[PDB]
Amino acid sequence: LRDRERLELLESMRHPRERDFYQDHTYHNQWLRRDLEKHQKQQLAARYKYFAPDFEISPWIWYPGDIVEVVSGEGIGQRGTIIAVIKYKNEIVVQNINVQDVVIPASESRPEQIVQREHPISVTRVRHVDPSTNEICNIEMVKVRN
Amino acid sequence: RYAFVEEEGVMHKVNWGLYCERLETELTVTQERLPQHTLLMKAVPSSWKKLDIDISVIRGLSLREAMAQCKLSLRKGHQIVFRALEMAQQGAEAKGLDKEHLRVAHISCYPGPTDKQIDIRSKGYYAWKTKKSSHLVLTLAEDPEMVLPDRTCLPYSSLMSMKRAGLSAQPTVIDVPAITADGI
Amino acid sequence: YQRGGWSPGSKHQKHMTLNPTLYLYRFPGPHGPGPYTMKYWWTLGCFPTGMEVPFRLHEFLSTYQQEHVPVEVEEWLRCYIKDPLSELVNASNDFFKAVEVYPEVESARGYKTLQPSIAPLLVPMKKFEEQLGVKISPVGLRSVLSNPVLKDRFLDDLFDYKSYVEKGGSTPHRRLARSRAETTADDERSLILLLTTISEGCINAGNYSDAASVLADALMFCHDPDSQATTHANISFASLLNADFKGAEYNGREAALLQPQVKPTSTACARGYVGWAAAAAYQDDFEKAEAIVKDGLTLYVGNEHLEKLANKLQALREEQPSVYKQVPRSLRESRSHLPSQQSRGLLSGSGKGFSNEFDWVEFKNKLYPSKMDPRNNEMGSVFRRVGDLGSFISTSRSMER
Amino acid sequence: SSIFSPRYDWRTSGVHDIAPRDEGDFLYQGPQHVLPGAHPLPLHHPHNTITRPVISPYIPSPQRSHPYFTAPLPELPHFSTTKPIVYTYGTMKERIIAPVFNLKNEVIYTRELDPFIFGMYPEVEELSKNLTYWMVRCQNFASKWDYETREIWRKAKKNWPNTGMGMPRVGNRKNHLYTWGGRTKPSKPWNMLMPTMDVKTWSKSNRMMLTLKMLQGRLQVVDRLTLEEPTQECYLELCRNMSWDVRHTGGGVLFMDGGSRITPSSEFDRAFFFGSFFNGRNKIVRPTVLCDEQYDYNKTAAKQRMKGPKGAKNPIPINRFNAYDAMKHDRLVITEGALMQLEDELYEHKLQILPPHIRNQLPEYGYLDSEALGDCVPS
Amino acid sequence: HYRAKLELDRIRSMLRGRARLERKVGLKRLFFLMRTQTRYRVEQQAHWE
Amino acid sequence: VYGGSGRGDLLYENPDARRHSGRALGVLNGVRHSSQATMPESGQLYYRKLILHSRPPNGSCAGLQRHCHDTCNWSYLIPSLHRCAESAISAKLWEKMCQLVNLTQYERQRVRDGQNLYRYEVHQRLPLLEESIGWAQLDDLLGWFRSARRAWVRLPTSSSAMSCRLEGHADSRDTTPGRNQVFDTPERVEQLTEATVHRIREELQRLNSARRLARDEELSRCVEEELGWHGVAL
Amino acid sequence: PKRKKNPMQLRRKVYGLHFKEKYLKMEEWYYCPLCAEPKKPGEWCRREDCRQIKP
Amino acid sequence: APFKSVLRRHKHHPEGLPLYNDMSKQWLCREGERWWLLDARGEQLPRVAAVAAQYITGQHRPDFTPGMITGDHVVIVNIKDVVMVGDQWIRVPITWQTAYPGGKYRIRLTDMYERDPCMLMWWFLKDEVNRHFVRKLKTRIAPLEKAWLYEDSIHPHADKNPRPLCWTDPE
RNA sequence: UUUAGUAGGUAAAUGAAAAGUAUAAAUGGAUAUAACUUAAUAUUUAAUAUUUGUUUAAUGAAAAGUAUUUUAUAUUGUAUAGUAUUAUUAUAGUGUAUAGUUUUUUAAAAAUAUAGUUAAAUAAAGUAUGAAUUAAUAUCAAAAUUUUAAUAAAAAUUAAAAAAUUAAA
RNA sequence: AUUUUACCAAUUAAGAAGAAUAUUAUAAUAAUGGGUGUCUUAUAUUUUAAAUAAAUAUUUAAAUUCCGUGUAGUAAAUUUAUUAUUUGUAUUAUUUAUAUAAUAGGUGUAUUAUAUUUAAAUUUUAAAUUUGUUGUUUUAUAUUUAGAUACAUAUUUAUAGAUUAAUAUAUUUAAAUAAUAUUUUAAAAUUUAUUGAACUGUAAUGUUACAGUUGUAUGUACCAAAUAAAUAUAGUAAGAUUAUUUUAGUUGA
Ligand code: FES
């Protein structure tokens, strides 16, 4: 009954005689810059931990079009091509590795449709594969004068 | 990770993940296959102490009589129970259970969230009034052998008043031939 | 002075000197926000104290992020929608498989065995309903599967529907595309028969509203005159059992009007006449019912249903002299006698102490207290206390208003 | 729990699942059956030669006073001791001769070991003195800081009268009774203690520990501890060749680098010191067992801003050889340079310990040939 | 001071209502019962039997 | 055995051992004597009876008023095995195996774990299946064979996992009564396979429109292919 | 307001009769012949037929 | 644990109080019961009461158990002829009391006899039964109901053949 | 209440772990323990007190509020006090006199407050909401008698004390 | 025809990052008062003084003295130095949250004394206080948690008197040179520095002026006022004080 959908049901169930005063205004001013609850702060940090300074990877060896193999997580040993890369999150999107349904809420012109797209994968999970060796190989950034 | 299970008198290692997923799947499917619909209403606007009384009143009744008593009562708990019964009846209808054979197999409440309100008092004293809420569990099962009392009977006063008005004491029952698809 | 803990959540009393506090009108407790604080949250947008910081990030993620879609994706999703014909074929296949593998009820002696719950049939049913634009009643399906004869008459119809659809026939889709004329096809006839079987199961269960809805969908599908007559008769009977006299009368009249288009062998016309007469009788117009029965007899002399209804009306007529006339026009419908009517009254009836004209009054789409009801300026109405807004006196009485 | 308490046996069922495992659970056939780990003595670390093999000519049997050679066998070029050996009180009174290995894990010759160093029979009281000193000294005293009543940051004023309110008489509630409050006498780094060790006791205990390792056969003399390159791969390769188990769960190795026989050095070899930085358990220590005489300038609270524990202000450095490290690391490796330095630094102490009727004979037998006086070529 | 806390909480299930629900009340009642039973056994049970 | 895992329950629960607990037990609900404070005498039949029967009804067991579930129904037991096999082996892997020995080590270990889990589940469900043989159904027996095939376990009709009995010396096995242990698992499974084959034959004999013709044809083709795969005829 | 109460001391009230009459009562009702709703004798609706003839 | 309901049977309740002779309880056994006849002619009232109580409470049986309430019925006859040693008939008081302030009733054995001698015998039997069992209402009550009193020599228990009760005094 | 058997070291008050004292790493109870000062929580009081929104005759400042005036309608700024509250309660400076300038439940009684002798009104239970002082307490303490170290429901004897609801010191 | 007595029962496995660039100590290299939504204007933005102080001192002797309130250059610019967001989550150790809850439809009795079911018997607080040892006195609703410091032990280098008032005399047997600590809560307190006249009390004509060795009963709902700092002979107030199964002397001198 704490949901907006059941708010009307809750109000109807509540007796008429019991009155709730501050329906439109409030005693304490609500335009003061104050903090949130500890659990809310923790949820914010967990949801966006990439806001921290120097969160990205400095060398950043991972670029689209490379070939990598997953070393940990759901799919282990499966390799593919990096479809996309999210640098500020340190995430990768590799074809046919992490496929999950992507629901789309219905609208006035179309109904709900379920679509599957590769989801981002943590950078540390995958390792580069050398095309010549076709095996897992350590990579390092190098500088060359073209 | 392996889980030990007693098999043939000795402990045997099985895949722990498969073991857990199988256990949870079996529990869920067994509960679903049970011929009953269970509903949980959270944050009921009624103190659990008071709501327990109405729950005990409504306990162990057929759905018809439970609804009738809740509608004929004047209690917050009874109104909440009526709402819960309506929701559970809709759920049972969607699940396929037979409405005419529905019965209440479990009705209980336990304390839920609790808001607090400040109540000023003279001499500078104050306290915190407690706004209580309850969690209501309502289970509707089916009892095909259940036989319901005949409540269509009405007082002789009503009978003779209707007779004076010209109405018929008995219902005007008309035989209704069953639907058929012979013409198709 | 101080008796309990210093925190606001402590129960017992405190004093201003020892434990001074701010004026917190109402705040959550140790066990999380309650219904009252959540009502404040949804209405005012924040807890009534105001010291709390609104935080609906999870709600935003649930609604706005989920419903957000770029223009190109929104434009291409419609083009990449699945194939309706193949999806319908797969839905029919899985539905038939589930129905076939549904276990048969054990005929126990001495008591009634509980019918096994239908868990796996819902999803196939849901997809089949979505594909065909029809709505099947789970209670009806349960009853059909429990009954052995109805189970076979449903399985054969479903198999015929599957075969005719796989043979390349989608009558509803083809008709819709052409409209964007002909008669009913084998596939459409099989679908109508399946829906009629489901409706019969619903009637056996007691769910007359579901039976009527299923038969209405079948009527929508059908286009043949004979199928229309039969479906109208079935809908009339279902509405009579469901206590929908206007619908029953309309369907019976439509069947009796379609009579000429139907061959003599069919009895749908007689069924429609019987339904119309029964609707009139329930509406308490005995003269009209007798006239309709007379017309039905003149049309099809010897019909068993017409003879039975004529005998019942004759018995009612023999009882009438006790009243010396028919039911007066004043009431003409007051008495209620159907179990469907009793169930409706039990469900939607105005309860004592709530769900009445004194508890809450439903405005256009909103709930109001009885005092604010715009349908009556009774002694408990705020409208009574208004008067003489400034334009004119507007009332002769000079004590209030 | 306590053996005598009823709680020791209040549980009577459910400890074991009566169904045994099908993997390794077995039955007791009889006395002829050899059970793993079974041994009549209470061995808290039931190791054998396969688990933690000993580097010595013989397994330390009770028949032998020590696993090492008792005579200079002619198969090898036996080397005498750098300084003459005099059997002081506590020495084993037996000749200690041990084989010296090279970087290839093969013996090259044999070397005499001084009884005063590797022949002082161990004693548990002295070893425990050393161990307790090391354990107390190796704490992070800076982390032993706790708040105090005067540090709780609360208003210095009675919070309410004695009797007016109705609650217990409490004023300036910074006390330990309150969760936010502190302690009258909390633990502080400057209040903690750092024990003061005596050079005599430290040397005696270290030599007892060395003798204990020698008796257990964990001692190994190596000609050199140099690496081809200062990397870690070379160090790991040397460990593999020498059969040193430096894993975190292999037994461990303690190294007294020092130097070779011809060029003893007080500084660790550069390449080996650089390459010995490895995760696994492997410790490098100085070639000395003595310790600088500990002192405490702040023996009284004269320097009020001293943020250090009361006691010795010159604790033994971590890398110094100690009983704790000797016990933790299975094998001990000592170089010829380390032996030379130990004998050189302990010769004077041994001679001073010797009684007078032997001290007077020392010069007669030639144990006091001073290079400074020209009696002998410089050592 | 030692009291049979752990030993008596085990049998705290043998009491009724408040004693069985609240640890302190049950422990006090069980301690009193044990002491009284000991006294009765050592000074009156033999006489009665 | 009342409050814990019972006859056909899959969860393994040692009632005496306080596993799955976040608290050290302070109060023992089933207590007969005050001496049980320090001498609970758990394990003894009568006191253990008291304790276990005082334990509340968990999810496995059901209260006297709550409606139980017909777990002893063949039409439920068979789909349970089918779901077990489906979860153990993914649809992709099942399709790959059917099309096809070149498999990944992870896939091979997954198949072995699935076979082991299926064998354990069959061991647990064996008494219920044996009791429910009589009033089973042909579709459910065909589903039993299909579930065995999907799990990839070849039933011992006389890879293979049922044919070999689990290791363990007979002097250490749990012979305690009241626990549904099946020491002769391969023999019991072979007897069950023969019984279900005979039941299928009897059902077909008893059974002997386009929908029903197609049903009979598909049923015969299934029966034939499944029995051939499992190494059975008729 | 002098001492705490125990569960049995609280259950004395339910033992009594006033509690049962105030809380644990079942209403006798029937289906109204006109509106087919649950109805208690002596109470009727505001519909014209109900007012004229009171079931 | 055991719980005796607060809703007890009260003398003011229509259900009334029971007769333990017709009751059926785990601690009641009338199978081994016998019937004795005690002729209290010329026998001192306290001695008669003690002798009767010994058989009534069942203490005269070697299988006696304090928990079990089993005893032989005793028909006391000629209670009118019961003797008191000396002037005790008027110098021995019987005292009871009501909850009212006045409350106290002091009466003489002469008055108790003039009202009902069986009442006096019942009083003395009650005194003995309380002397031996006082802590339980059932124990205090049941033996008294086992006892039978008759002032005359005529009793209706002839259909039970109550054997005469023979005993000897301490002297 | 002048003794044995069996338990069982001894004739009564200075805790016990071989598991971070870690090489130990999937089934280690390391169960190793403050009834009154701390903090939080759950109860009793509590079926409680309180609350209950069907009727209005009358201020044009400022300190005081800051409660999002979508565009409220030279420069700058318009509405929504204080007593911890939407409370006893008009903040009155100026100034004026027909704007009806509009939120106070309920079917009795006690008690309590108001209201043709002599020197009769108002405040219910119940539906609904829901505090506070208090709280060692076993399902509890009818009563009388007798006695023990100060009230002694502490002891003993004697006796016979039903449950709920309201009121009464 | 009709109908199922009254009473009595129990807390546990936790669904999800609703716990870390976290808590405390630790860096001997920075430093003109940090203030973002800031954003001219400097008659109007000035804090200095030879003293125990944001600079802080290695021992027991003698010695003024009515309880001796007490110890020197150690190296001379010599390294005991007031450190500090990362070129290691800086390092090392240390500490850590009560959001969340179906639990069972009847083992004991049924005319009243209290857990262990053969019926009975026993049973009806604890701690401190009270030394005339109580019936005096005080505290405790319950759950979980917080809560208090006298080093139970000294292995070879090694070596230790006394004595007179004083001079002096010194026939004549030991020894493991180690110091730092010392319950806990609470005194009518007093001391230092500071604010308050919107309340109240005066003078002036709502406002102004006067204030804690003190202004005019009171000075902002405890007038020996309020705010900030402090651990006074806490002693000759009182209370509390964490570890069962024990192993030896006196019970009013
Ligand atoms: S129709 Fe039922 S009350 Fe009028």
Label each residue of C16-55 as H, E or C.
CCCCCCCCCCEECECCECCHHHHHHHHHHCCCCCCCCCCC
Structure tokens at F32: 């007969």
φ and ψ at residue H37, rounded to 5 degrees: -115, 125
- How many C-beta atoms lie closer than 10 Å to residue C35's C-beta? 26
- The strand pairing partners of D69, in sequence order, are D97
Q: Do chains G and B touch (3 or more CB pairs under 8 A)?
A: yes
Tokens found for residue H99: 């909850």
**F214 with C159: Cβ contact below 8 A:** yes
Please give the C-alpha separations between residue F202 and each of D150, F137, F138, F148, in angstroms, as whole numbers. Answer: 93, 11, 9, 21
Could you tell me which residues are beta bridge partners of residue F24? none
Give D54's DSSP letter.
Answer: -
**CA B74 to ligand 1 center in whole angstroms:** 18
Q: Under a CB-based contact definition with an 8 Å cutoff, are residues F219 and F142 in contact? A: yes
Q: Using an 8 Å Cβ cutoff, are C191 and C197 in contact?
A: no
Strands H163-164 and A79-86: unpaired
Q: What element of type H or E holds D285?
A: strand D282-285
| D154 and D171 Cβ atoms separated by less than 8 Å | no
Strand partners, H15: none
3-state secondary structure of H63: coil
DSSP D225-254: ---SSSSHHHHHHHHHHHT---STTT--EE
Tell how strand D253-256 and strand D282-285 pair up.
parallel
The alpha helices in C180-267, defined as continuous H runs, are 186-205, 208-221, 225-242, 245-258
φ/ψ of residue D311, rounded to 5: 120, -155
Phi and psi at residue C395, to the nearest 5°: -155, 140
E22 in reach of chain F (CB within 8 A): no
Tokens of D23: 């993997």
What is the end-to-end Cα distance of chain F in Å, rounded? 41
Proximity of residue B121 CB to strand I below 7 A: yes
- Cα-based angle A106, A112, A115 (whole degrees, multiple of 5): 130
C360, A15 in Cβ contact below 8 A? Answer: no
The helices-and-strands tally (H runs, E runs) of chain A is 2, 8
Residue nearest to atom 4 of ligand 1 (CA): G45
C291-309 exposure pattern, b = at least 16 Cβ within 10 A, e = fewer: ebbeebbeeeeebebbeeb
G23 belongs to an annotated ligand binding site: no
Residue whose token pair is 């007899």:
C297
Q: How far off is chain B from G3, nearest CA to CA, in Å?
A: 21
> Quick check: E8 CB within 7 A of strand I?
no
Residues near F203 by beta carbon (within 8 Å), at least 6 away in sequence: F137, F138, F141
Q: Return the structure tokens found at D376.
A: 């002998």
Q: Which whole-number Å values give the CA distances from C319 to B30, C322, C324, C335, in the listed order?
A: 57, 6, 9, 17
Pick the closest to residue D69 from D104, D102, D118 (CA basis): D118
User: Does residue G29 have a known ligand-binding role?
Assistant: no
Cβ distance F147 to F81 under 8 Å?
yes
User: What SS3 class is residue A20?
Assistant: coil
State the Cα–Cα distance between residues C141 and C125, nearest whole angstrom: 9
**Spatial contact of B121 and C31, defined as CB atoms under 8 Å apart:** no
CA distances from D78 to D71, D72, D119, H124 (A): 10, 6, 19, 117
CA of G27 to the centre of ligand 1 (A): 17
Here the contacts of H82-89 (C-beta below 8 Å, separation 24 or greater) are H82/H40, H82/H41, H82/H43, H82/H44, H82/H45, H82/H48, H82/H117, H82/H120, H82/H121, H83/H42, H83/H43, H83/H44, H83/H45, H84/H44, H84/H45, H84/H109, H85/H44, H89/H113
Of C154, C155, C153, C190, the closest CA to residue C169 belongs to C190
H or E element that contains C314: helix C304-319
Determination technique for this entry:
cryo-EM
Q: Is G42 annotated as a binding residue?
A: no
Residues of B in contact with A10 (CB under 8 A): 43, 45
> 3-class SS at C387?
coil
- The whole-angstrom distance between residue B98's C-alpha and the CA centroid of its chain comes to 14
Angle between helices C148-166 and C186-205 (to 10 degrees): 160
Strand I close residues, chain D 246-285, CB < 7 angstroms: 248-249
Q: Are B88 and B152 in contact (CB under 8 A)?
A: no
Nearest CA to ligand 1 atom 1: G35
User: In this complex, which of G27, G30, G33 lies closest to B69 when CB atoms are compared?
Assistant: G27
Q: Where are the alpha helices (DSSP H) in C62-170?
A: 66-67, 71-79, 84-101, 122-132, 138-146, 148-166
The tokens describing A126, both together, are 């995958």
Dist CA C301 CA C305 (whole Å): 11
From C273, C255, C256, C269, select the one nearest C313 (Cα to Cα). C273
Q: What distance in Å separates the CA atoms of residue D370 and residue E5, rounded to the nearest whole number?
A: 76
D108: phi then psi, degrees, rounded to nearest 5: -115, -35
Cβ separation of C139 and B97 shorter than 8 Å? yes
Q: Could you tell me the distance, in angstroms and rounded to a whole number, from the CA of residue G44 to the centre of ligand 1?
A: 6
Distance CA(C242)–CA(H36), nearest Å, equals 81
* Alpha helices (H) in A1-146, listed in sequence order: 7-13, 38-47
Three-state DSSP at H163 gives strand
Alpha-helical regions (H) of chain D = 115-118, 124-137, 199-216, 232-242, 270-275, 323-328, 336-353, 356-359, 361-365
Q: Does the nearest atom of strand J lie within 7 Å of F22's Cβ?
A: yes
Q: Give the separation between CA F36 and CA F34, rounded to whole angstroms.
A: 5
Going by DSSP bridges, is the β-strand pair H73-77/H35-39 parallel, antiparallel, or unpaired? Answer: parallel
Give the integer Cα–Cα distance in Å for A68 and E9.
Answer: 60
CA distance B65 to chain G (A): 9
User: Which of G31, G46, G49 shows the shortest C-beta gap to C345?
Assistant: G31
What's the rounded Cα separation, in Å, for the pair C199 and C214?
Answer: 6
In whole angstroms, J90 C1' to D304 CA is: 28
CB atoms within 10 A of CB C90: 15
Best of B2, B4, B7 to substitute, by most chain D Cβ atoms within 10 angstroms, is B4
Identify whether the C-beta of residue D96 lies closer than 8 Å to the C-beta of residue D68: yes
Neighbouring-strand partners of residue B119: B127
Q: Are strands D219-222 and D331-335 parallel, antiparallel or unpaired?
A: parallel
Contact B98, B37 (CB under 8 A): no
Q: How many CB atoms sit inside 10 A of residue D246's CB?
A: 23
Q: Would you tell me the crossing angle of helices C122-132 and C138-146 to the nearest 10 degrees?
A: 120
d(CA B5, CA B23) in angstroms, rounded, equals 13
Distance measured from the CA of protein residue C133 to the C1' of nucleotide J116, in angstroms:
71
In angstroms, the CA D219 to CA D56 distance is 7
Helix (H), strand (E) at residue F195? helix F185-207
The nucleotide lying nearest B36 (C-alpha to C1') is J102
- Please give the C-alpha separations between residue D265 and each of C75, D259, D285, in angstroms, as whole numbers: 81, 5, 13
Q: Pick the closest to residue C275 from C311, C231, C318, C317 (CA basis).
A: C231
Residues in chain B: 184
Please, are residues C91 and C83 in contact by the beta-carbon 8 Å criterion?
no
Distance D185 CA to J192 C1' (A): 27
How far is it, in rounded angstroms, from Cα C260 to Cα C316? 31
User: Do β-strands D107-113 and H104-108 pair in parallel, antiparallel, or remain unpaired?
Assistant: unpaired
Q: Ligand 1 pocket check: which of G34, G43, G46, G54 to mutate, most ligand atoms within 8 Å of Cβ? A: G34
Question: Which residue is listed with tokens 């018929």?
Answer: B168
Q: Specify the DSSP class assigned to residue C133.
A: T
What are the E-state strand segments in D30-118?
96-101, 107-113
Residues making up chain G, counted from first to last: 55
H26: its two tokens: 């785990």
Atom of ligand 1 nearest to the CA of C334: 1
* Long-range pairs of C147-151 with CB within 8 A, sequence gap ≥ 24: C147/C201, C147/C204, C148/C104, C150/C197, C150/C200, C150/C201, C150/C204, C151/C104
For a pocket test of ligand 1, which of G29, G30, G31, G35 has the largest count of ligand atoms closer than 8 A to its C-beta? Answer: G35
Answer yes or no: are the C-beta atoms of D199 and D290 closer than 8 Å.
Answer: yes
Residue G9 marked in a binding site: no
How far does residue C338's CA lie from ligand 1's centre (Å)?
Answer: 15
Cβ of A15 near strand I (under 7 Å)? The reply is yes
Beta bridge partners, D112, equal: D97
Are F174 and B6 in contact, with CB atoms under 8 Å apart?
yes
DSSP C354: S
3-state DSSP call for residue F88?
A: helix
Nearest to C102 by CA among C89, C117, C91: C117
Structure tokens at E23: 């640890």
Read off the tokens for A90.
Answer: 């340190």
Strands of H43-127 (E only): list them: 73-77, 93-97, 104-108
| CA distances, B35 to each of A92, B97, B144, C117, D290 (Å) | 47, 7, 11, 6, 85
Contact assignment for F209 to C106 by CB distance below 8 Å: no
Owner of token pair 């153990």: F88
Q: Which amino acid is at G12?
A: R
Q: How far apart are CA B55 and CA B47, in angstroms?
A: 12
Q: Nearest CA of chain E to the CA of G6: how many Å?
A: 6
Report how far apart, in Å, the C-alpha atoms of H171 and of each of D258, H85, H167 are.
115, 15, 12
Answer yes or no: are the C-beta atoms of F124 and F8 closer than 8 Å.
yes
Compute the distance between CA of residue F97 and CA of residue F103 in angstroms, rounded to an integer. Answer: 9
> Would you give the DSSP letter of residue D79?
B
Residue at the smallest CA–C1' distance to nucleotide I40: C5
Chain breaks in chain F (C to N over 2.5 A) after: 100, 158, 208
Q: What are phi and psi of D195, to 5 degrees?
A: -60, 150
In the structure encoding, which two tokens stand for residue H75, read together? 């028909």
Q: Which amino acid is residue B32, in one-letter code?
A: E
CB C214 within 8 A of CB C136: yes
Q: CB distance from B45 to chain A under 8 Å?
A: yes
Cα(C260)–Cα(H33) distance, rounded to whole angstroms? 98
Token pair of C400, please? 């209030």
- Sign of the four-CA dihedral B2, B5, B7, B9: positive
Q: Is the dihedral of CA C299, C213, B145, B26 positive or negative?
A: positive
Q: Which residues on F lie below 8 Å from D11 (Cβ)?
A: 40, 42
Which residues on chain D are in Cβ contact (under 8 Å) with E7? 6-7, 10
Q: Look at residues F125, F129, F126, F114 and name the one whose alpha carbon lies nearest to residue F161.
A: F114
**Alpha carbon distance B120, D180 (integer Å):** 30
Whether chain H has a CB inside 8 Å of the CB on E47: the answer is no
Give Rg (Cα) of chain A.
Answer: 25
Rounded Cα distance between C234 and C212, Å, is 8
C28, closest nucleotide (Cα–C1'): J99
Q: Which residue of B has its CA nearest to D21?
A: B11
- Chain C residues with beta carbon closer than 8 angstroms to that of F135: 106
**Which residue matches tokens 């606007």?**
B45
Task: Collect all residues with Cβ–Cβ distance below 8 Å to C161 and sequence separation of at least 6.
Answer: C92, C187, C190, C191, C194
* Residues 10-29 in D contacting F (C-alpha not used; CB under 8 Å): 10-15, 17-20, 22, 25-27
Name the nearest CA neighbour of D129 among D206, D182, D75. Answer: D206
Under 8 Å between Cβ of A90 and A31: no
**Which burial class, exposed, middle or buried, applies to F112 when counting CB atoms under 10 A from its CB (0-12, 13-18, 19+)?**
middle
C311 at interface of D, judged by CB pairs closer than 8 A: no
Answer for the pair C282, C240: CB distance below 8 angstroms, yes or no. yes
Which of the nucleotides in strand J have any atom less than 7 Å away from a protein CB atom?
Answer: 6-14, 17-21, 24-26, 28, 56-60, 80, 82-83, 92-94, 97-126, 141-144, 146-149, 151, 153, 155-158, 179-188, 221-222, 227-231, 237, 242-246
Helix (H, G, I), strand (E, B) or coil at H108: strand
**Cα(D34)–Cα(D28) distance, integer angstroms:** 9
Q: How many CB atoms lie within 10 A of CB C356?
A: 14
If DSSP codes are grouped into helix, strand and coil, which group holds residue C343? helix
Residues A9 and C42 sit within 8 Å (Cβ to Cβ)? no
The residues that bridge with B2 in the sheet, in sequence order, are B15
Of B80, B88, B71, which Cα lies nearest the Cα of B53?
Answer: B80
Q: At residue D329, what is the residue type? A: H
Gap from C28 CA to chain B (nearest CA, Å): 5
Contacts of H43 (CB under 8 A, 6+ apart): H82, H83
CA of C247: how far to CAs of C135, C222, C233, C262, in Å? 19, 18, 11, 22
Cα-to-centroid distance, B79 and ligand 1 (Å): 20
DSSP category for residue D13: S
Q: How would you class A5 by CB atoms within 10 Å of its CB: exposed for 0-12, middle for 13-18, buried for 19 or more?
A: exposed
Distance (Å, whole) CA D341 – CA D348 = 12
Name all residues whose Cβ lies below 6 A of ligand 1: G 32, 34-35, 37, 39, 44-45, 47, 50
